[PDB]
Design a protein around this motif. Structure first.
Motif, mmCIF file in Angstrom:
data_model
loop_
_atom_site.group_PDB
_atom_site.id
_atom_site.type_symbol
_atom_site.label_atom_id
_atom_site.label_comp_id
_atom_site.label_asym_id
_atom_site.label_seq_id
_atom_site.Cartn_x
_atom_site.Cartn_y
_atom_site.Cartn_z
ATOM 1 N N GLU A 44 0.838 -1.193 0.000
ATOM 2 C CA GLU A 44 0.000 0.000 0.000
ATOM 3 C C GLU A 44 0.874 1.245 0.000
ATOM 4 N N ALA B 11 2.438 7.765 3.508
ATOM 5 C CA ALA B 11 2.516 6.457 4.146
ATOM 6 C C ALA B 11 2.786 5.352 3.131
ATOM 7 N N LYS B 13 3.129 0.831 3.097
ATOM 8 C CA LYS B 13 3.135 -0.482 3.729
ATOM 9 C C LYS B 13 3.541 -1.544 2.719
HETATM 10 C C1 LIG Z 1 -4.204 4.168 3.298
HETATM 11 O O1 LIG Z 1 -5.542 4.703 3.446
HETATM 12 C C2 LIG Z 1 -6.551 3.766 3.835
HETATM 13 C C3 LIG Z 1 -7.865 4.512 3.828
HETATM 14 O O2 LIG Z 1 -7.898 5.515 4.834
HETATM 15 C C4 LIG Z 1 -6.196 3.201 5.194
HETATM 16 O O3 LIG Z 1 -7.207 2.284 5.597
HETATM 17 C C5 LIG Z 1 -7.773 2.683 6.855
HETATM 18 O O4 LIG Z 1 -6.870 2.421 7.944
HETATM 19 C C6 LIG Z 1 -7.362 2.721 9.263
HETATM 20 C C7 LIG Z 1 -6.268 2.338 10.232
HETATM 21 O O5 LIG Z 1 -5.855 0.993 10.039
HETATM 22 C C8 LIG Z 1 -8.675 1.989 9.525
HETATM 23 O O6 LIG Z 1 -9.203 2.403 10.779
HETATM 24 C C9 LIG Z 1 -9.675 2.281 8.419
HETATM 25 O O7 LIG Z 1 -10.864 1.528 8.623
HETATM 26 C C10 LIG Z 1 -9.077 1.927 7.065
HETATM 27 N N1 LIG Z 1 -10.022 2.216 6.000
HETATM 28 C C11 LIG Z 1 -10.356 1.333 5.053
HETATM 29 C C12 LIG Z 1 -11.348 1.806 4.034
HETATM 30 O O8 LIG Z 1 -9.878 0.203 5.021
HETATM 31 C C13 LIG Z 1 -4.848 2.505 5.126
HETATM 32 O O9 LIG Z 1 -4.478 2.045 6.421
HETATM 33 C C14 LIG Z 1 -3.764 3.450 4.599
HETATM 34 N N2 LIG Z 1 -2.516 2.731 4.397
HETATM 35 C C15 LIG Z 1 -1.362 3.088 4.970
HETATM 36 C C16 LIG Z 1 -0.176 2.231 4.648
HETATM 37 O O10 LIG Z 1 -1.280 4.058 5.716
#
Ligand SMILES: *[C@@H]1O[C@H](CO)[C@@H](O[C@@H]2O[C@H](CO)[C@@H](O)[C@H](O)[C@H]2NC(C)=O)[C@H](O)[C@H]1NC(C)=O
Lengths: 50, 49
Positions: A44, B11, B13
């Motif tokens: 990601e 960010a 990952k």
């Molecule tokens: C990139 O963005 C997405 C969307 O905001 C992130 O997904 C969220 O992450 C938080 C924390 O883990 C969760 O509480 C949300 O529910 C997630 N949203 C969805 C739609 O899945 C994602 O973590 C981000 N990636 C990185 C590597 O920061």
């Protein structure tokens, strides 16, 4: 002629004239193979600006 | 008056996972009843002896 009795377990058998021997050379061989592989990759990126 | 306020986020990952699970077994028997041979030589993975 025949009638020499051949015992396998309790059963006595009459060997055919054509047959040199029939004999319970009992044996067994089990081969088991199980090869499992997994791969995952999970990338990601979240560029953001204001 | 002049004002300017500038933000960036970036960010990233990356996860990777690998498994290999190899299992091999060769029970071999001579002698005894064919049914007892096949019953015993059938590898029971929880009790392989
Ligand atoms: C990139 O963005 C997405 C969307 O905001 C992130 O997904 C969220 O992450 C938080 C924390 O883990 C969760 O509480 C949300 O529910 C997630 N949203 C969805 C739609 O899945 C994602 O973590 C981000 N990636 C990185 C590597 O920061």
């Amino acid at each position: 002629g025949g009638c020499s009795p051949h015992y396998i377990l309790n059963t006595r058998f009459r060997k055919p004239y054509n047959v040199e021997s029939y004999t319970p050379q009992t044996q067994g061989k089990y081969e088991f193979i199980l090869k499992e592989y997994e791969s995952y990759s999970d990338f990601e990126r979240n560029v953001t600006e204001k | 008056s002049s004002h300017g306020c500038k933000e960036l986020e970036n960010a990233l990952k990356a996860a990777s996972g690998t498994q290999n699970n190899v299992l091999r077994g060769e029970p071999f028997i001579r002698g005894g009843g064919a049914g007892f041979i096949s019953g015993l030589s059938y590898l029971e993975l929880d009790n392989p002896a």
